Amino acid sequence: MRGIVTIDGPSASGKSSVARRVAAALGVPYLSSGLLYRAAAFLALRAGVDPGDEEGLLALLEGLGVRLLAQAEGNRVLADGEDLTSFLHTPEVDRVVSAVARLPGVRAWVNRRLKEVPPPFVAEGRDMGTAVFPEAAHKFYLTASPEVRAWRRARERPQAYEEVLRDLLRRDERDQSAPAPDALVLDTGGMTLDEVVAWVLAHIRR
Ligand SMILES: Nc1ccn([C@@H]2O[C@H](COP(=O)(O)O)[C@@H](O)[C@H]2O)c(=O)n1
Numbered sequence: 001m002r003g004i005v006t007i008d009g010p011s012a013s014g015k016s017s018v019a020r021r022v023a024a025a026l027g028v029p030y031l032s033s034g035l036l037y038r039a040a041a042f043l044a045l046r047a048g049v050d051p052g053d054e055e056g057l058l059a060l061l062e063g064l065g066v067r068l069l070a071q072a073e074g075n076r077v078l079a080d081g082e083d084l085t086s087f088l089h090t091p092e093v094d095r096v097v098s099a100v101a102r103l104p105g106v107r108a109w110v111n112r113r114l115k116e117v118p119p120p121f122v123a124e125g126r127d128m129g130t131a132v133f134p135e136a137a138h139k140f141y142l143t144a145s146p147e148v149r150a151w152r153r154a155r156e157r158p159q160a161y162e163e164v165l166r167d168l169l170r171r172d173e174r175d176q177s178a179p180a181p182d183a184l185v186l187d188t189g190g191m192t193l194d195e196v197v198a199w200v201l202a203h204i205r206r
Contacts, residue, residue: 001026001138001204002120006128008179009142011168012149014188014196018142019124020074021197026204029070031117033125033132036110038088039066039077041097051096054105061109068113070121091157098171107131129180138204141179142196144188146172 005022009015016032023030040061044051047060069076076085087093100106111132114123123132129139144152150165157164179185184203186196 001028003138004119004133004136005122005138005140005200005204006133006136006180006183007122007124007140007142007200008126008128008130008177008183009188010126010144010149011171012153013142013144014152014193015124015142018140018193018196018200019122020072021193022200022204023122024072025197025201026120026122028120028122029072029117030075030122030124031068031070031114032075033110033114033123033128035075035077035085035088036066036068036113037097037101037106038093039079039084040106040109041093041100042084042087043079044100045092045096051099051103054103057100057103058105058109061106066113070117089156091159094153094157095167098174102175127177129183130177134180139180139183140200140203141183141185142188143179143185148189 007015007019019030043060043064044057049056049060051057064079066077066079069078076083077088114132129136146165146168150161150168154161154164186199188196191199
């Protein structure tokens with residue numbers, strides 16, 4: 001695989017772990033777009049800025065040279081040389097990331113970073129196959145019910161399914177990229193993620 005593979009889906013749909021596994025199996029990097037949005041949210045929080053000031057947030061993001069490091073075991077984000085990754089998959093970031101992800105300048109910043117990487121790679125996100133790499137040769141979209149998404153997210157947070165589901169449902173209401181028209185759509189509530197990885201790899205290697 002010498003081009004680009006995109007794997008998009010809603011939160012906790014499995015696109016991150018599937019992308020990491022598919023990429024490892026192909027011997028190419030994977031790019032987690034969400035980790036960049038999480039980093040922008042975490043930095044805006046810690047910086048004490050009003051995230052509605054896009055100009056100031058973008059000066060902060062550009063000034064700290066925030067960069068995505070693709071490592072086979074999992075991506076890392078460094079800001080002024082500091083690895084922020086351990087602070088990004090937390091309840092506070094989950095709860096505020098939507099406020100910065102909707103800012104056009106922040107999406108442009110994330111997309112610029114991603115579009116810098118030389119192919120091949122597997123990129124995962126919400127809109128990798130639609131907004132960022134519409135030319136990708138292999139596109140996949142993973143669907144998942146709110147219930148299985150809340151169950152998976154709860155496994156990785158202090159909160160339980162009951163609360164996570166309420167949170168995800170309110171977030172869903174609050175906003176969206178649909179699958180790309182040429183993406184293979186797979187529901188991760190029917191197939192196990194191990195089966196999804198195998199199925200995605202069989203399509204890529206054909
Ligand atoms: N391509 C992407 C990836 C993530 N996001 C935003 O980043 C937030 C975090 O990403 P994750 O569900 O992939 O970890 C998402 O909830 C969403 O707000 C996005 O808006 N577009």
